[PDB]
Nucleic acid binder design. Sequence first.
RNA 1: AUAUAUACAAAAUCGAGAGGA
Lengths: 128, 171, 810
Amino acid sequence: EEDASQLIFPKEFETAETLLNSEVHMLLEHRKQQNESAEDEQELSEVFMKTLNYTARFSRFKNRETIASVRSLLLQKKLHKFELACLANLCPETAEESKALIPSLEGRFEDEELQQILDDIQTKRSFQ
Amino acid sequence: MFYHISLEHEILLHPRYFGPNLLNTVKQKLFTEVEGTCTGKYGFVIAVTTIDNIGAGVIQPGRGFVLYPVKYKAIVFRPFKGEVVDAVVTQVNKVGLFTEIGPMSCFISRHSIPSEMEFDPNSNPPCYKTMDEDIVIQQDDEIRLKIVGTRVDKNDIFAIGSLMDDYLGLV
Amino acid sequence: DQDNEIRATDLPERFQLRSIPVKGAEDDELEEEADWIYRNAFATPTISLTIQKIKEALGFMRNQHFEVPFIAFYRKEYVEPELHINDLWRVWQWDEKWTQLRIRKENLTRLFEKMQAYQYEQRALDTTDMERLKDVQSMDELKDVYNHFLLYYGRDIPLKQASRRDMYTICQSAGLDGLAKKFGLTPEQFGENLRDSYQRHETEQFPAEPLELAKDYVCSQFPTPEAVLEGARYMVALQIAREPLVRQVLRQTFQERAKLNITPTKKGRKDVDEAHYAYSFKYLKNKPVKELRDDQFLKICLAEDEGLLTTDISIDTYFEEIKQFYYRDEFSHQVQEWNRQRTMAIERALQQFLYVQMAKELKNKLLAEAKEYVIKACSRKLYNWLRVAPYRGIRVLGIAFSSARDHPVFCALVNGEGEVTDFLRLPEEREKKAQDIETLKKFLLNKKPHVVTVAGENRDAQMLIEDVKRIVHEIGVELVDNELAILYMNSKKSEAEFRDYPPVLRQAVSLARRIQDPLIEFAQVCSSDEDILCLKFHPLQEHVVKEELLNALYCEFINRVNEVGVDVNRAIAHPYSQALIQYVCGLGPRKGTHLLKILKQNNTRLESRTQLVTMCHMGPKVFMNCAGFLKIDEVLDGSRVHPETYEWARKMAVDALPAGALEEILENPERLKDLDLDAFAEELERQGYGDKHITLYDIRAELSCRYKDLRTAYRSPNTEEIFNMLTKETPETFYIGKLIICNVTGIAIGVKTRLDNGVTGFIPTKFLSDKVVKRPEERVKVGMTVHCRIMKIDIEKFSADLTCRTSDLM
RNA sequence: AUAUAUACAAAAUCGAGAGGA
């Protein structure tokens, strides 16, 4: 019933706040900071590990401010939080790749408007 | 996808924890209970960020325990059908490619791998390749893939992938 | 069904199984192989653990289809003295590797050619097609070539392309190639500079400073002309770090000057203490990889997988050396700029591409060496089991037992042939023990069994052997290992063969069978990969690759089974032994069961060896492969001589002085030295055609005694063996100074403490401080358990000093 | 240079009558 491509979600992920893999990243090492210190605490689960490594492997922005800026930039334009996160996580190159990856951007914007959007992403994309 | 959502829980507090430092105990029990688990309604529960409200703790008549209802926020990772995410192959079989989209495990049946690719077990690292090897997926490679189907198993989500359409696969 | 053609084709079974099927050679392909096999299978590894020979062998393997045993036992002169059986197995192992490489090198050849076409249609490939691909001596450098290509030409496939991660292509969008070219010194060249460790190619200055060139290229993805410098450096970096030549030198550098640092993770500081395996390297610093010992890195890496420890491989500087190249001298101040950019480009290359990838490469190399050691050890251990001769068929009696507290002893008399004859159960006390002893002697009198063997489970084997000794004197008695028998018992087959018996009788039959001929029993009870792996060949066995490990173990079996050879008839008439035939070279599980089949079906015994192709349908190549190795107690069949040498052997028989001739020779060698090796060899230049001297030397040997067994003769275990067997832990596992939980029993002047290991623990009188002084109760109450530290061992009596003083405990 | 055990709740319903406080 739930369909990302058709932009369908169950009611719980309507007021949900999305993230970018780099947001999740920085928060997960934040929690590593909490865990490594504060002894007499349970070690983080292998699930926590798998997600940590993954988001680390694909966090396209390695600076907090840059992530914030990315976000903010995606906010000011009418976009769904879902597409917000998919664009920022996937970092597509050309407008047509975006459509292939995020069909829910079908007809929403113009390919050129979108293109300079993507370009704005990429230009904020931090070196690492 | 990763999200940040608000949730519900009631903890029973044994009377040994009445005393100073008892709300901490309500915390620490929320931590030790909710985190690390996976539920199909919400998907992988990565961690709990910030609680909101500790309710009024009702002594249960007889039996001692106090029941505190709690409000809290947590990170969750919930795939959805028709989504495209990056994934890392961990191992390659003639059936398909086992990948993981983070904590979740995903699989791409041979049929879902395009037709050009063939599976080559004979390779020094086993891999799926084209005859000319212009594109080669093997261990540790990152790929994009459409989550075409997901399934619940023991509160554990695993996805079903596809590399059909344009701009998927080997990154 | 695959099994049908395999049973039916004319190649040895184990040839069809292999993933890369075996295709003939060319003798130029073969020479290049042999060179490769030499260099790679005989170059020093990174942790401390003729080509014509390889040529000849590969020829045998790949063109004639001789299996490694036939090469090894019937083409010695070709490959000896420089290849042994294990060497040939290694050679065929690496021939697979060669072929994989050849096939990937081919694939890449085509891919490159296609790209050349496409480029002609429209940088380019000129020699790198030649220079690189043809000169790929290793899969590693093949990936360099391959990834190198994919950087530049990978963009163009003629579905959509699936944009890359590394954002090189974002730069390549905005002509950032312009800058990269304009940094001096194209990456090929730089790699050359490294390769020679001195500035073979000078750089190219420019009439500007970086920024001005940047204004040209600063557009859209990169405004702010510094951002285009960043892109340019990054471009330069990947290009450097993908360049194969850079990779070669830097891969080497890592090989030679690689240090290993280790620290413990939160989880590790706590749980790594003095008995955890990792204790010796919980903290390492600048351990050079050249010093990693045999399996040490396997442990290190396991300990990292357990997360309790964290590691890294590096060189420390190298960067400093390197930067001296891509550099210029004059102080113009418009070159200190370019030099600075140049430098930090190389930083990025090394710091986030090459160092990392080289570290993973090396880790895998090391780790895999370690693995190999472990496999090697497991193989060596099995070699040792299998290389022990039968005792001096024989009626063996085998006694097994258990904890024995309310559990009886069964013994099994196993015939010479190996079939169990009869069994006996042997369950205030002193009279009970006495009655048992009496009935034992009754059994032993009645049915005189040559050898009485007693399991090893614990100290009780000692008393058990000594009682039996006490009996027999009034014909040998031997302690015997019990590890395989445990496996037999637990296995479903033992149920199969003895539905009625209790399990410990199943050990009894086993332990008798193994003493009679260990190879047969191992082969019978190690029937499947799971089974063999149940045995404990090495502590780390569990971590090495199942496939590789099974391979080594099965090859060990193959080796010995061929030396021992297999009598088909007995494997018929006593279906116990059927397992062997699998390992006879030329045969296999499929081919073997087939042969046993036809023989069963026809209800005939192999009267001869030529009866094989004659009466069964086995093709020429397999008969050549195997036939050597099938005893048939036509007299030459029961001898290691091959059927292709029967004529030479008969000739030698005549030259001794032909049924009278042979039987006389068999009755005695009238003149061993009747022969002249040189003379037979000389003739063989025109009759037999080869330097078959050693073959003759063997045939003479074989005429001496038909199938002389080459196993080593049995020896009862050295007391070290007894110790590590009954106690079941190793010279390593008694770490003198280990800490151990022991139980105190009773001051016999001492403090007699029983170890869980079945070991007596004698806290010495010095710590005790009471010989004629009051008993030491005040130090400790009798009855309970304490944990103390070893300070001496008495293996020959199973006693170990211990320690009271927490000073010793610290 | 020694030292023997371990299984689990069995017993119903209806009707009548006689009593007890």
